[PDB]
Amino acid sequence: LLSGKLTPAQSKNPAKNELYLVEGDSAGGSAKQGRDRKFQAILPLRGKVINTAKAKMADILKNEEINTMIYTIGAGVGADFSIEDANYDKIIIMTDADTDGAHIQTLLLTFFYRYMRPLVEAGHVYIALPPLYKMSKGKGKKEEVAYAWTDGELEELRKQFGKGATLQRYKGLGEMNADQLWETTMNPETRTLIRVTIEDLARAERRVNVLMGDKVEPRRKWIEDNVKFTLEEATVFHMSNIQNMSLEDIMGERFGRYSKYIIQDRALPDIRDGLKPVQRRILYSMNKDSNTFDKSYRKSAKSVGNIMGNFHPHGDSSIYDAMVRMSQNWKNREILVEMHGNNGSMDGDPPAAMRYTEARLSEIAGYLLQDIEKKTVPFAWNFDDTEKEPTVLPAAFPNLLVNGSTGISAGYATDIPPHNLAEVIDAAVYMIDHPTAKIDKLMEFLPGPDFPTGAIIQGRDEIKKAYETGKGRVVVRSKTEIEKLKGGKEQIVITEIPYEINKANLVKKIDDVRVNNKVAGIAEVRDESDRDGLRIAIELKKDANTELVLNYLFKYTDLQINYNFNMVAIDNFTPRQVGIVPILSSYIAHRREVILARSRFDKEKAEKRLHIVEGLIRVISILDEVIALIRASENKADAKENLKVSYDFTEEQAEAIVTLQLYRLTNTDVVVLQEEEAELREKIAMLAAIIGDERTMYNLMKKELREVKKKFATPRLSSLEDTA
Amino acid sequence: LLSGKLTPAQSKNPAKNELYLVEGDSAGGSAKQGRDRKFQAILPLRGKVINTAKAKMADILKNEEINTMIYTIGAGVGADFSIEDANYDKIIIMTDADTDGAHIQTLLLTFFYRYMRPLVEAGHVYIALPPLYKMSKGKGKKEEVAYAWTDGELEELRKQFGKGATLQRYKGLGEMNADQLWETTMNPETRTLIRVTIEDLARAERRVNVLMGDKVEPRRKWIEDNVKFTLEEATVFHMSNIQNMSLEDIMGERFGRYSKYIIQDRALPDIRDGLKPVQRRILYSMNKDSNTFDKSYRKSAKSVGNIMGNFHPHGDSSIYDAMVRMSQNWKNREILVEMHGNNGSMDGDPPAAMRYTEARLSEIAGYLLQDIEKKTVPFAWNFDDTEKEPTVLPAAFPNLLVNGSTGISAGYATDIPPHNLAEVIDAAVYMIDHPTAKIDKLMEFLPGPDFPTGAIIQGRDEIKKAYETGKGRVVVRSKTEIEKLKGGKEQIVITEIPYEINKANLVKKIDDVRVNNKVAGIAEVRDESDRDGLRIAIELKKDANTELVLNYLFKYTDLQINYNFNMVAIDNFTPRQVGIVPILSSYIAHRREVILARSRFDKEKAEKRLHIVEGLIRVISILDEVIALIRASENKADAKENLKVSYDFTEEQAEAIVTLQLYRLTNTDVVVLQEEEAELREKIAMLAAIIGDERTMYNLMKKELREVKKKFATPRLSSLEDTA
């Protein structure tokens, strides 16, 4: 039931037959359609293959996908592996030419290396190579489709005696027709493979264990030593026919590519705006489409489709789940998306699918995007070079700390808990005035996290350690109170639970305590929560020891947990473990760049208008000459030329004069224009002084942070305690 | 496994407890969140409930949803039904306030009427009424939100505290938050219910059997007698508290609403453009978004999400599957969508989901939309009154016959097979010249269907009957050929199969014939089809009788089938069974309206431009005076007034003069404007003649249809034979 289904070849022939291991059932379908059914079999992989270096050998051998591979190859598994029983001469791995494709290659290669080594050794395991590019279009009798695998092969194809043709940049196998798949990647005559060889059993064994073994620290080290976070990779001169590569180099190049991508571009937040790329794209796309807080909700499926088609070439379930999370006020301290409909619950009940719900950006989310239209932040080409997207948002509140981040990458993970907006701003403002400020002083403004689920955080020293180093362990404990009853009876009443805990599962875990009588005293467990309030009632038997029961429950259920800070974020393209000081100084440095770039943008605009207004006032004095000149001129371009040469107007002034509508000649009021010149000069002065003076800039930064605080501040929800 | 999961009430209490039967798991989730958990239980319904009047009893008691309803109510079924054992005092049906909601009510009420009648009889079965409208005035005072169920309650709310207020039109329970659901529809204090009463067991029994029984003809008749296809329905008038209604009237109102909707707005094509609403929306939306044949493909999920958000308030799987079908050249003779990726196959393998594929309109589909921008076709408000959509497309080729339609409605179905485009145009052009043309003569141009799957159609007389009446039965038979082998030995080779037949299932069925040895002689069945062509090989045993085998197979497999024509389409809002004559004359009448409206649009545009050009020629002769005049004027309106009074320009001319940009005075070439005057006058004359003379209009209609034919004609694929 759980594995890809094998489409076998029509005829047995272990001399020639090929098993295609295909990334995904949909591309598996295309391969089924495009293949030569006589000798090529198709086994689709349902996403990420089990890591056979990490998992246990019972567990590996109860994995459906692995079993159906061992069945099909018909040769046992290593120890019992008879290459002379093998049903194929080639096992051909065919994935997307993308980073998750690279990962899948890695995982499969570790299975073959670890349990079918003769197969690898004999050079029977191959890879793929789909094209990255398709060029050209000239109708039916076509003369205008070729394919390319490198930028250099692409440059070659651009030279075609034609003009501009069409270029497709392939994102995956799922954009290719079965004809195209066969021609480019499955036909022995025309495909390009990589034969995987072992050049050195010792260097291979090392490289596979470091990349794919249980131990993080060597993999982290390998990544620090090998991955170039601030440089692109050069990428191979694509050789045709077959081309050998060592298991060593394939594993290193593939896992390097994947690692770098999921570190920088998936699971870890940017230190400045606090966003993962998917979250930033959600916000930018919704904002670009005017799906803001002040306008009506818009069908989720529409938002998600625009996000996917314009910015984020990944599954809609990934996009939609991230958008839903941004709407849930038990996950985010300051929700960034407002969602009508079933956006889930603290019981973890499934949110309605995107066909049902509708959404827009929250008001505070607009503050993440404030001044994105004023060239405040670096943009980059989207995935297919049709549109630009921000690499970071202006971020007028410090979202990294306010909403936190929880992610799992390669060689790194991150847990940054949420914080109270007012308190974070208070620390930031202090640090604007005192750049060398120390943790003890900062903690007067920012004493600890502020979970949206409230509860009690215990461990002042551990907060401090986390704020210093990025790592610490604190206790988070449910808010409880005792309530008397009839019968000489008490009940424990829970009104706030720990962050990230599922209420329904907690209730079940507590009820199992009672059922198994692990501790004595429990009469009944009732969830009495409703739409207005969380309320769990643990009703105790007559003369139960309520302290014994409550302490048992703190210890052995998630009624209390440990929260481990592991504060990692992307800073200068590279993952970095950070305390509060780097977090806040990065934010400040970011706001500095934003305010300066905004001020330049606005000043340029005001100067252009000023120069135009000066030109219009001058035009009055020479109106008859200007009209005559324009009438004499051959066209618009010529008229402007004559204005500059004859009368010393700038380009911008000349463009403005020649595009005036005739009816504007009714107005000869220079006084209103002079008033505007003066207003513009005042503004330019203020903007120039912000650019020319660090302290003027910093004082504007504080004024704006204080405004955000005043508008969005809410009371702290979690209480802080020192020890137990 | 297959049923909605019950969320029970906390405390048993048959006096007060309520079972909510909720349309869909997602709204079931919202109901779970919004309820009062003490007495309200939630049983979600997974879509359409089994029709307990139609289906067997084997099937009814094998149905998971029905069984879990019987279980939960706790009162046996039918014969053994004890109302004093019932676990709820109220069974409350809560659906979307939409047509499929109405259908679900209908199906449930038939179950309770037939197998829990005492429950209905005692007035314990109710229907929750969700609001249609929410009215709001944004952030502020308090947020300010009231609800409405009728247009009259809506009109009231417009006054109330409304003016600069936003109105949400609810499309489903899926757009409501759990607190909104409780306030409006689940709280006993504030909800409005309908108690379902039996006023008359005899009238009820009849009304349930006609609407829900397996006999179509009475239902068809009931629909003809009761449903008003060309009138709106009256508003309910919504009373407070509970309000009783007879099972008779409920069933009639609800099933009438459903019937009309799926007849007019779902399963049946419009006779003019040949489209179902979902298909027309796919085309209009993709065309509006510039997703045409000449431009880059676009991610399917983007198209689909725009279609859903702007036009088609239904599931993405419905939309995407319809788009995919429009792309499959074994379903459509002239594909309307071009789709890259896995768009399925003749084996029925699942198309890739919308996250993988990308799409655009085909070139010929552009001809369905030609001149949509020239006020050629009636538009109507979309589902939420934000955007207009066409009720029918201009349709520059007769798509109803060319691409056909297969559909299943209420009381009616449709099968219209595909046809060859050139042939259909030939018939249409003949009929333009010979309005009273008869079937025998039309069939010289249009001899029969042309399936995109080819094969052999047999039964000339039955084609003629179908072309006369809309109904007939023809044989469709696979194209076959014999091939010799070494061993002397023969094989039957199939290269074309019947329309709508799955190849893989046919192959399997033939192989079962071999295995069961129903006819002597079959050695092996092999599908040897590949990307370049269909080829199924039936290898016979030495000295098998080819003809005996082939005859067995035609008779007892789908290697040959009957195609039953049942040509139903919507004509003047009403379903109608139609032969070729009404189909073609409707088309012609449609193109007449289009060409006339286009000609009026273009003529009006030319006349406006002509008047402007006349004024611009006059301006040039008095340009100095005009510029001086404008300079003497106080403002735009004064300048125009001075132009009218001093020089007799019209309003339109004056507005055009005074909004000229100064650079436009570089071009005062009166001869070029005179040339333009002449060209415009010639065009107006041509356009006027089309409007003033039917034959001029019909000649243009034929010229255009012949151009389409010349561009898009392809040879016949199906062969026709006279005897079956």
Add this chain to the structure above:
DNA sequence: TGTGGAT
């Protein structure tokens, strides 16, 4: 075991 973006 479970967190959250991915296949």
Add this chain to the structure above:
DNA sequence: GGTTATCCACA
């Protein structure tokens, strides 16, 4: 529309 897998780091 629920259900069912995997990866990755870190308790």
Add this chain to the structure above:
DNA sequence: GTAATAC
């Protein structure tokens, strides 16, 4: 026992 738009 399957077709195609719906839940």
Add this chain to the structure above:
DNA sequence: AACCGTATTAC
């Protein structure tokens, strides 16, 4: 991403 239900008409 496969797999699994139902309505509706008509063979």
